[PDB]
Ligand binder design. Structure first.
Ligand code: HEM
Ligand code: HEM
Ligand code: HEM
Lengths: 131, 131, 131
């Protein structure tokens, strides 16, 4: 992640956070439509699972300057996700799915440049989270 | 549908209306979770669909003193849903899941009475759509 | 926008204008300073992205007595602006910042009465552009 990509995450988050709720939710809907089989793993109120996903993305954004500093957490999150039955192949599909939704919801307002950046960021988080 | 219960819809909508977006979105996620098979029927952007869905429930509250005056829209729609491969048996499921989605997001801000009341309304608009 | 203000703008503009480049640029520089992360959003050369800023400013002055006529043009602006990744909370910066830049380069040559009149006008441009 370079400088340009850092500044990009921060600007884009100005649009995302305000609508983060909808996106989280829109995400979940699209993920359950795309791979309807994963939905069983979600055993808690979809409403409050989304507040939790968005929260980490905010965390990522608050910490985009030094992501190393995050490794400790994402690992703990990786550990917990494995308990859920989340496995490797799931990550690409969640990555693709969240983006199409952040695109979907924000439209032309989620800029090509920005999408690229988030695609890279997710990527990392994902690696890190899959020890 | 009585004037007491005609009160509660006007009342709780003022609770639903401001949250329509998240509520509409969580519904589709819950739904695609509960009855996974039916997601394949929804072939349009979930975002825009939820927008379409809430607009109608608006129209519904907007006309709750005289619903007989909507039997024509409520049937133009009945025929289009038929054209969408919706069948009668879907309405109980959706309704059920809709109402449990309005309670999820609004919590203790959506009373057993508001639930009971909407329960009927959906109940009605459906039987008119199933013509 | 009372008759006084309409005149106050025409005047200060007779002063901004001869120095329109110098100012245009000072502004970006002071912008990037006040806000380290906005630079990314600017993908064209600053030397010319600034020519465009000072053009619309001219257009505004060049139309002051009638902004109703300018509401079209401006709506398109804000439209393409939203797709640059620019979100509402930027405009205050860009505002505060621009004035402070015009004032920086003119010093005393820019009346306190004119500075107020530019705030209003910039203000009005925001509303109309921010939809
Ligand atoms: C970087 C990517 C991800 C982030 C930031 C994230 C975020 C979260 C968070 C914060 C939790 C809260 C529970 C906890 O404290 O561990 C959670 C739980 C969960 N996540 Fe993720 N997640 C990600 C990737 C995935 C993937 C790829 C899947 C696979 C479908 C997934 C599915 C789940 C499931 C099934 C739960 C448990 C649901 C329950 O509470 O029953 N997540 N996720
Ligand atoms: C009273 C209850 C319902 C209401 C108010 C409602 C609302 C709507 C609305 C407003 C549209 C707009 C598109 C149009 O018809 O012009 C629509 C289409 C549609 N509805 Fe419903 N709906 C209801 C029940 C159901 C049920 C039970 C199903 C079956 C699961 C369903 C599935 C669909 C589908 C699949 C479409 C087309 C989706 C697409 O765009 O591809 N709806 N509905
Ligand atoms: C009333 C205030 C503003 C005016 C009159 C204005 C004027 C312009 C004009 C004329 C353009 C040329 C692009 C086009 O014609 O579509 C432009 C582009 C642009 N403006 Fe503004 N602008 C204003 C406020 C802002 C604000 C608040 C931002 C936030 C950073 C901003 C950032 C940008 C960016 C990033 C571009 C495109 C740069 C590129 O990629 O080439 N502007 N602006």
């Amino acid at each position: 992640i370079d400088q340009k990509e850092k500044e990009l995450i921060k600007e884009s988050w100005k649009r995302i956070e305000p609508n983060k709720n909808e996106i989280g939710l829109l995400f979940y809907a699209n993920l359950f439509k795309e791979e309807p089989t994963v939905s069983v793993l979600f055993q808690n109120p979809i409403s409050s699972q989304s507040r939790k996903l968005m929260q980490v993305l905010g965390i990522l954004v608050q910490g985009i300057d030094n992501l190393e500093g995050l490794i400790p957490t994402l690992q703990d999150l990786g550990r917990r996700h494995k308990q859920y039955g989340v496995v490797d192949s799931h990550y690409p599909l969640v990555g693709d799915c969240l983006l199409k939704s952040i695109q979907e919801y924000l439209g032309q307002g989620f800029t090509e440049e920005a999408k690229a950046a988030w695609t890279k960021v997710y990527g990392i988080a994902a690696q890190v989270m899959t020890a």
